[PDB]
Design a protein around this nucleic acid. Sequence first.
DNA 1: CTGTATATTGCG
DNA 2: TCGCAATAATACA
Length: 204
Amino acid sequence: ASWRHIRAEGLDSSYTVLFGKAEADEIFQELEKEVEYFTGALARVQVFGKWHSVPRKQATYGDAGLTYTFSGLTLSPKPWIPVLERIRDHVSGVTGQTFNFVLINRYKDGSDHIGEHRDDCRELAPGSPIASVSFGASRDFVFRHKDSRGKSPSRRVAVVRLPLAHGSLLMMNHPTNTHWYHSLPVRKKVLAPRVNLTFRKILL
DNA sequence: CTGTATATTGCG
DNA sequence: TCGCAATAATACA
Ligand SMILES: [Mg+2]
């Protein structure tokens, strides 16, 4: 397989296209048909002392007993469904890595987005890679170094930007998530939905 | 002079 | 349209 390697100080990621257009279309269609997203109380987070409905849709699937907590919200995983098992298994065969959990974020259009954060969970296994699989509209994905944020930053490490295309895989390897914040910024010109799956290895 | 951390507002 | 510092109120260590 041919990878585009994304390297910088404390940044170690790789990008590849897994599926051609026809297959990625079929997978996207099946995801749209089958994935059940959280609503209501399970779609609200607390950040900086205020509660917000998330500006997107979220779903969690994976092995029994696991939980996923961030920003005052705890999500329980739904049992695996065939479309998700298909992708999980393909990623595993391509990378040599295993996953027991997937977070699904759906961005209805360019106005849907996700703010800056690190995936520095306690429930995430130490040094475990994260596999980010994208379907639908291409969206720009942004890495920012932790020491380069704020009015008076410690460092001036350049922002790393990557478009994530339909049918693509972004592998985020250790120690990417200790040093770098990532986000999916608003892109007003994007009119079409995007579904992103982040496969992870969660501790019970 | 000085603790660390975290969705939209309010600019530019 | 885009980017980004400041910060909704606490919760730590
Ligand atoms: Mg993340």
